[PDB]
Amino acid sequence: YREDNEKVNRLVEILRELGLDCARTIEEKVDLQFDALRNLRENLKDDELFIKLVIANALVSYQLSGKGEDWWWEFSRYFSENPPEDIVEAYSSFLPNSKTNRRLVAGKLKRIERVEPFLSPLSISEIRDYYFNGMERLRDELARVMKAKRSAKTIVFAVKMFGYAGRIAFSAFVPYPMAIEIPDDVRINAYTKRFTSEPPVSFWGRIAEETGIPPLHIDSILWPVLVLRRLKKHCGEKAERILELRDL
Ligand SMILES: [Cl-]
């Protein structure tokens, strides 16, 4: 493949300097979705219900009628005020009446109906196992349940959000698996072409191995590269390194 080795070498070193510490700070302090999850977890006081709601919610988080951060806050406030029991019934009222996710409701409710027989029986012990030692397994099982490709964008997003939910519920950071490849993203794809003609999944897999940053955490870092005020206020002097990534 045609590669700009010098630019790739700089990219790797900048990502090494940011590291998992920066990715985690972006996920928890820059991404307002994380605080939305903290609010819901505190208000429900039922970590099994909280985590299952996050997975189901992520599986319907496509073609939104608003910004992602607004949607996750609407979800958090709605289920804090109207805590659910029957998840299909709850979403049947929530989605068409929401501001930020009222499009394609029929297909979204079918997806909730499809996932609930898998999520409902899970115990907190099994959920802990998925979080601490099984996020790749969860991705594969969700894809099977949903009759979706293993790399399907919304399946992978559900695992990403599950990682946030577990970090909150279990008070421990577990990095995303190296095996979950870089998400398929129009902005990432255009950025990759600055460095190589190689397909991004292969390229970012090597970058992940060379930096020790799993691809889903690289994706977190690339979000502000590709909000900026919130980053400068939380990553400290490492915020300039984010600006270095955009200008590569
Ligand atoms: Cl999907």
Residue ending a domain, among 145, 175, 205, is 175
* Alpha-carbon span 61 to 215, nearest angstrom: 20
Catalytic residue among 153, 184, 193, 233: 153
In which element (H, E) is residue 161 found?
helix 153-170
Looking at this protein, which amino acid is placed at residue 207?
I
* Alpha-carbon span 242 to 220, nearest angstrom: 11
Cα separations in angstroms, 178 against 38, 45, 181, 182: 25, 31, 7, 10
Centre of ligand 1 to C-alpha 165, Å, is 19
Q: Which domain holds residue 112?
A: 31-175
The single residue listed with the structure tokens 């397909």 is: 199
Residue ending a domain, among 149, 175, 201, is 175
Sequence-ordered list of residues with C-beta below 8 angstroms from that of 197, at least 6 positions apart, any chain:
1, 2, 3
- Is residue 175 within 8 A of residue 166, CB to CB? The reply is no
Sequence-ordered list of residues with C-beta below 8 angstroms from that of 170, at least 6 positions apart, any chain:
47, 128, 131, 132
* Alpha-carbon span 82 to 80, nearest angstrom: 6
Nearest CA to 230 out of 29, 68, 71 is that of 29
Q: Are residues 46 and 144 in the same domain?
A: yes
Coil, strand, or helix at residue 50? helix
Told to judge if 4 belongs to the known catalytic residues of this protein, a careful annotator would answer: no
Is 33 labelled a binding residue?
Answer: yes
Is 157 labelled a binding residue?
Answer: yes
Catalytic residue among 35, 70, 140, 185: 185
21, two tokens = 């510490």
Q: Are residues 130 and 160 in the same domain?
A: yes
* Alpha-carbon span 7 to 195, nearest angstrom: 6
Supply the DSSP symbol for 53: H
Centre of ligand 1 to C-alpha 147, Å, is 8
Total domain count, the chain: 2
Centre of ligand 1 to C-alpha 156, Å, is 8
* Alpha-carbon span 103 to 55, nearest angstrom: 19
Question: If you count them, how many residues does the chain have?
Answer: 248
Looking at this protein, which amino acid is placed at residue 1?
Y
Q: Are residues 6 and 87 in the same domain?
A: no
6, two tokens = 């010098």
Centre of ligand 1 to C-alpha 62, Å, is 9
Within its chain, how far is the Cα of 187 from the centroid?
16
Method by which the model was determined: X-ray
Residue ending a domain, among 118, 143, 175, is 175
Told to judge if 185 belongs to the known catalytic residues of this protein, a careful annotator would answer: yes
Q: Are residues 169 and 190 in the same domain?
A: no
Is 129 labelled a binding residue?
Answer: no
The single residue listed with the structure tokens 């790399």 is: 151
